[PDB]
Amino acid sequence: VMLPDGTSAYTRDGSFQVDQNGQLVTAGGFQVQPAITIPANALSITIGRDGV
């Protein structure tokens, strides 16, 4: 997770949301380091055993 100051933290609890701009962020306003951008007009999000 990319902290607001600029460094990187690590978390274990996974419960994510979406910001107003479409980035996948955790509860609290912190974004994910790979910066997965969920596009608009989306029906559903699917995640397999891998990270895809």
């Binding site: 949301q17 979406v18 107003q20 701009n21």
Partner: protein, 302 residues
């Protein structure tokens, strides 16, 4: 431990066949758009809709429903207009004069020329076919326009104009329209005719263009009219209103005329669980929710 903010699951519920006419449900993501008296805009998912003393689509608590306004003559939906309150007026519509009348007539190539050379309006054999066309004026009067087919020679038809609703109408004798078909009976040209009725009750006569397009004289045994259309309607009265699957509100009248009074707009947020609940089951847009991102109920993932 600190409470890190609650969240709401926005999975779709189960639809129930309540009945009624003023109740709708959304099978996927989408929120109805609501406004208060103060002008602020709220979003909700309540299907319960009712009218009020002002004949407006209002929720059960008293918030007006907003949607695409219907404007024009004839009124039509606009997808480039700002959201506006949806209203079913009780005002009666006025008559609209017929302007474009088109018919399709199938003629017989094996039809011999009628024996009587001079045209007659009081004898059926004088004309090959008779064609009654109802035309409405700007007052509502019905003009019983009669069109007569007469075949004079090979691959040639004489079309005349006659009106029955006018007691002062003059019996036609001369040729008003000449129709020539192709080698195979396909219509080529001369199918557009300007026909004007006669004034009655001090109302101006109805001027319209008569079309015989898509007509063939190939042998079909007997003359048969397969189509007849016009664009005039007498004044009507409000009877019933129905909501279709597209969100449009259509009111039925006496003359079976459909009048579109608007369609329901659906707003989809770029991110759910960012809406702040306000009193009853409505939500107000804020940060962590994005723009309204409006759209129609048909496509656009709504």
């Amino acid at each position: 431990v600190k409470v890190a903010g609650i969240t709401q699951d926005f999975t779709d519920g189960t639809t129930t066949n309540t009945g009624r006419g003023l109740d709708v449900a959304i099978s996927q993501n989408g929120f109805f758009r609501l406004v208060d008296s103060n002008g602020s805009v709220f979003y909700s998912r309540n299907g319960q809709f009712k009218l009020d003393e002002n004949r407006n689509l209002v929720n059960m608590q008293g918030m007006q429903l907003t949607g695409y306004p219907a404007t024009g003559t004839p009124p039509t939906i606009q997808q480039g207009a700002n959201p506006a309150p949806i209203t079913i007026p009780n005002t009666l519509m006025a008559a609209k004069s017929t302007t474009t009348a088109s018919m399709q007539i199938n003629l017989n190539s094996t039809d011999p020329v009628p024996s009587k050379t001079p045209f007659s309006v009081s004898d059926a054999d004088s004309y090959n076919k008779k064609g009654t066309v109802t035309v409405y004026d700007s007052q509502g009067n019905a003009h019983d326009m009669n069109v007569y087919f007469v075949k004079t020679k090979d691959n040639e038809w004489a079309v005349y104009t006659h009106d029955s609703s006018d007691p002062a109408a003059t019996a036609p004798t001369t040729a008003s329209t000449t129709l020539k078909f192709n080698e195979n009976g396909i219509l080529e040209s001369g199918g557009t005719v300007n026909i004007t009725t006669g004034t009655i009750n001090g109302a101006t006569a109805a001027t319209f263009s008569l079309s015989f397009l898509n007509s063939m004289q190939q042998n079909t045994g007997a003359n048969n009219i397969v189509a007849t259309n016009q664009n005039g309607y007498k004044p009507g009265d409000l009877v019933s209103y129905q909501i279709n699957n597209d969100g449009t509100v259509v009111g039925n009248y006496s003359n079976e005329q459909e009048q579109v009074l608007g369609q329901i707009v659906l707003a989809n947020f770029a991110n759910n669980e960012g809406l702040a609940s306000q009193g009853d089951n409505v939500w107000a847009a804020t940060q962590a929710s994005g723009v309204a991102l409006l759209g129609t109920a048909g496509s656009g993932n709504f």
